[PDB]
Symmetry: D6
Subunit: 165 residues, 12 copies
């Protein structure tokens, strides 16, 4: 039971990296060029896009993916130099658990569970409130939900292993 868990954790991690790396870079490519607002004021599109999308999803996901792989690299570099290992194993597991729980909570607090098609903006130089329109909201919602689903499994597995000890 504990034998297969490692294999499936490795497979889930590789699957997530592959899915993010191969297709996700090209849904968001036209994010700002097809964002449009009903207005004649110069500079309103920039401010309203910036307020609607402060950090793009793909940047957050790349950062999370890179940051969740550091303890393994540290352990590998230590063992390579060696040529209390168990204490290092315990500590890196603890750190990975903490980092992944923090990242999941931050994702939930930053983005929620949906991307709406309309956005209402009231930032200078826009006069009062204006209405703007988003590109590809359904695909982005699907990607959001898929990533949340993938991220839950890793949390579950790491808690499993934490509790087996």
């Amino acid at each position: 039971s504990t034998m297969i868990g490692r294999i499936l954790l490795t497979v889930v991690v590789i699957f997530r990296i592959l899915i993010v790396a191969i297709v996700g870079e090209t849904v968001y490519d036209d994010e700002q060029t097809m964002f449009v607002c009903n207005t004649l004021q110069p500079g309103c599109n920039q401010a309203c896009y910036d307020r609607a999308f402060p950090i793009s999803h793909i940047r957050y996901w790349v950062f999370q993916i890179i940051m969740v792989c550091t303890p393994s690299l540290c352990f590998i570099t230590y063992s390579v130099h060696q040529s209390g290992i168990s204490r290092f194993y315990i500590i890196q597991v603890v750190f990975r658990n903490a980092l992944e729980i923090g990242f999941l909570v931050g994702q939930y607090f930053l983005y929620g569970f949906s991307v709406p098609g309309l956005y209402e903006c009231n930032r200078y130089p826009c006069i009062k409130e204006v209405e703007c329109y988003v590109s590809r909201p359904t695909e982005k919602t699907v990607f959001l939900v898929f990533m949340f689903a993938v991220s839950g499994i890793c949390v579950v597995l790491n808690l499993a292993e934490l509790n087996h000890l």
Copy 2:
């Protein structure tokens, strides 16, 4: 008879991956930039494109291709770690069969067998119903039919092997 079946399954899988990877990424590249509707309302093109094409074909095909290769990776990782194999062989065959039948059914239910050149849209902010025009419908229909044809062979072969036992 059962000897050649494995060889042809491997060849079909590699053929499908190559066809999707090399040429398919560039028919759909201009999907939204050349989508146009007869209207003067800002934001209507975004809503009507989103309603006509919720998930693009190439994303669905990439996802399917990646998801149908996971049991092999699991078996390989297990055997590498080993350094009841037959039970694992049986189970992974069952899982692959199920996944490929599910994906074929989902393709049929999502897209059908044709891409029409006209689309009729009645989503806000569009006033009543408007007419929009699609890019490269014939090429996309050809690609659809080809992919359905390729996908049928794999189902047939996997049922063959399932029934030989």
Copy 3:
């Protein structure tokens, strides 16, 4: 005489792959962005481009190139697994001959021997018949003729080897 034939067949095949792969992808890149019709009707350009160019040359050539290399892969996979070979050799030669004759005939029936600079279109939403103008017709004609020339040699060589037995 039969010794050099294999060497020249291999050289012709590699030459064709290289020519198609390195330069051909960039003559057709602007095929639709510089296609223009004399009209004020929205959606006429899409319909007329689709009727004038149902499948682009480069897609057909990539498909043909990929499909004419499958018997070799099958023979290689069989021999690798082995670790009646002559019957397989005979059959794969027959199949390659048939496939290449079919593809040459299909090319002739699909495209002919020239690409004209003007096209006359009468498809909805275009009113009656309209005149449209093509990009780079001379270069595309040169490419067509070159590909036909290259494809003839392979047919000749394969018939040669078929008849030597």
Copy 4:
């Protein structure tokens, strides 16, 4: 205590290179195409963009990254040719410390800690003072702060090792 310091220095350096190389090249790609000023004078956008952004962040960061890796290459080339090493070790550590402190100070003096959304320009051919609007200011501020944070750790670690001797 001094054992782990080398491992963490190597990990921080690799992390910085990866973060800069993979995602940073694509936030700044549209820096000038979406920069716009409220004016009708030809040539004002060029002058005001040039005055607001004399050297782009990504160029400065690439230059710094490349320049902070030269002492290691020199030491490696020397040792490879060998086939007073300790004096070379001391000197290269001193040089790396100096270079990294200089680069951090220069970053602080060139850019500060924020990127504002508005810029006021009074350069010819602009008449008097004009107002211009920046793209993606929040993301660029986040990147600035992250890079400052990363750069502080290296300074601390190098001072640590300098003082251990």
Copy 5:
């Protein structure tokens, strides 16, 4: 004297390939997007560009480069299979000489020694004669002259070796 000739021939060939491959692909990239004619007739730009530039320089140079490397590949494939060599050596030298002289003559007859900045066009649908304007004529002239210079050396060297026997 005959010893160094082979070394310099190899160096010239590699130099030509590198120069063509690394920089030449990006001077001609905007060839048609910045070609403009003084006219209001739709379709005149396409016809006049096609008449002014029937085959682009870079296509001709790529084709020539690929075609001048075939005899070496043939000799290599023969010798690999072997595991009258001198007759093959003689014949391939003769063929290479002929091909390179033909290609130099064709270059001279196709393009000449300069690219002018203005072009006068009288092709349908253009009314009578119109004036059009070319992009980057000086850089293209420099490239033309450089390529002619490079190509002369190879002819000289091959005639040298032909005459030494």
Copy 6:
């Protein structure tokens, strides 16, 4: 003293190649698309850009970089074939010195030490003299100065070694 000189020459050469190859290709990418003149005459932008920038900096630098590496390749090919070496060593050093001094002088005579923001043009079809505006002049000036600085070191080092004999 002569031991370290070779190491530093190699490091400077590699540094120059890396700096030119990684970042320099993307400052000049938009050189002509953001070049604009105050005029209504068709074709004036092409002529004035061509007169202001006959050969772009990056082309000159790539050519120089490629041409300054040929003597090493010649020496390597000779020594590989060998399987009066000192005379070849002397001669290639002389040739490298000459080539690098020529290239530095040519750079100084072609470009000078600055790129101004305004340019005054009087070429047909422009009527009398017109004013045009350049993109990113400060960054291009910085690059110019940096390249001159890098190029001076190599001249100094090669004269050093020439005079040690």
Copy 7:
């Protein structure tokens, strides 16, 4: 009682002529230039304006005003030539009554009592139904109501005189 009736009839007639002649010609002047529809189809504005406004109000009112003054001119011309009068007086009164009742009924049946601000159009070449927007609807409604009010008095007065005999 019958003495003042003639005086007030004359005053009402003159008042109506003056009101129509002096101000009414300039509310409707921009009727079609400021009529606009939400569409991109050429020719839709013409068809929809024609269907919304078949005959403009001012034309109908001018025609009515001219036609209601003919019996007086006939009586005057007869009496001038004279240089059974009572029978002519009776008959012309009858005819005037009939004409004015007919014109009031026709006005009611042609225009109603209001001019709406929106109009829904489904005439070729408009695709399906489109929405169009009218200029100055409130002023036109006020004019309509005023004219109906003025026209009622004349009917009442003429019936009065008819019944006094």
Copy 8:
């Protein structure tokens, strides 16, 4: 019976002049500015408008009105100079009859009984046949019918008087 005929002829003539002079000049004012064709060819609108409307209705009607009043002026000038009258009376009646019958026939042969909303044009520089759209067709049809009705009465009356003698 013959007494009233003169009075009614005079009233009809004055009515026609007033109707044409006061309102008719302003329906046709925008005849060419709101005429539009579905095309991108310069000069097609001019040719198609000229072919659809060779002589405008209002010019024909003004000419007819002026030409039908000449015999009265001649008779008046003769009688004024006098300070065989019956022969002149007979002859001028004959001439007026002939002129009015000719003008009615010409109207019928020039314009018919309706103005359609669409017109199909095939005149140079228009390519093949194009579709154009007319302004205010219903109002112009109403005016046509009204003028025909008015013109019939005069013919009838003049034949009446001709036959009474």
Copy 9:
């Protein structure tokens, strides 16, 4: 004292008519062509202009001027026909007083004392509230104040004469 009052009343009336008739028709001529709103929605300008200016000032003033001259015309027509006068004099004075007081009150209730330069609009098809800008507000305010001043004198004079009896 009562002698001059009639003279000054006549002079004030003529002055008002002249001022309104000669210059007032040309300040308001461009009222709608230079009215503009900050929006991209078709039809918003029409609705917002109609809501901001339901009846234009000049129409109201023309109507008032015409309506305040009817009692004099009635008295004149009566006296002309005569060829209880004092009762008619009394009654017409009463009626004129009432009409002028009503018109002054209505002016105050319709327009107030100023025309602002900005207007805030929230009528369909405008999304939420939009800002629009008026033409020539200061001149229109001056005209408003002048007309109120002129209208007060007539009220005062008529009350004077009413009270003298």
Copy 10:
């Protein structure tokens, strides 16, 4: 026979004045606003219109009409002052004859008998020869022919009277 000639001369003169004054001023009103040339050069339309139409028809006709009425005014002023008359009568007849023959000849030499729809222009700043398109050519041809016809009668009549003496 000589009695009626004066009456008909007076009628023809008045007819010509009326025809020119009432309708001719409004065919030529849009002469330059709807004149268009196929070109992108600023200033070409002005030069080509000026070369095609140096003096407009209506100016020439107004000038001729005014100049042919001066002898009558002179005779009238003389006779009014009187309060050798026959010598003045003779001389003014001679002068009128001469002036009208001169004007007819000048008309023929200036304009000819037709107005073509196309005009070919080669005046600076137009590059080489360009094609331009005229407005309302058929109506202008009809007017030309009518005016020539009218002008012939006056010449005939004046020669008649000249020869009767």
Copy 11:
């Protein structure tokens, strides 16, 4: 001396009325349509035109002309009714003098002696200060100076007559 003064006063008054009435109405006709500012903000042109030209010159001059003719009308109406005259003569002279001095002073205080070609504007919605450009400044300056010159003579003459008593 006092005899001619009245004649010249009458001639000057009539001259001023004629000059203002015949030509002055058509220099200012395009005052706002050719007023333009260097800005992209909607509504800035309206505010800046209103601030630069609060009341147009021609309105002020028409008002002054009308107001300076009232005392004569009053005297005429009094004398007509008569069918202490000297006291009325004295008083009306006094009033005319006062009115004309007031109007001249007001002209000087409102407009000055010149109309500049540039205007600097800082009114909302304009951002900071913007530059705008006036139409026909020299002609307007000439008109200003001429009107001041004309107005001085009347003041002088009226003071003359005032002092003769």
Copy 12:
């Protein structure tokens, strides 16, 4: 001889007034709307039109026509009041002579004898010198020459009468 001179002077004066009043007002109507310069600078057209045409021809001619009729009005007003005449006759003749000579000289000094089609402008905000293009230069030259011719006759006649005394 002196008898006819007065008659011809009166006829010439009336002819000049008629020619200026009837046709001249409509050649210059589009003077600024069709004036265009080759430039992209806002405000350059206004400055260059103002510098090319400070006072329009028609204004100068109207002013001259009005000013040359004042002595007659003065003499008429004097003689009307009378109900030393010869001294007044002498003086007014002298004044008319002086005024007409002054006006002819001023015309020559202001305008010359031709209107060119091109104008070269160097006024702010135009950068350096720009080229502009005039409307209808030939017609304006014809008008200039005609007016000079007409004006010469009056000078000659007035000198004639001056010298007869």
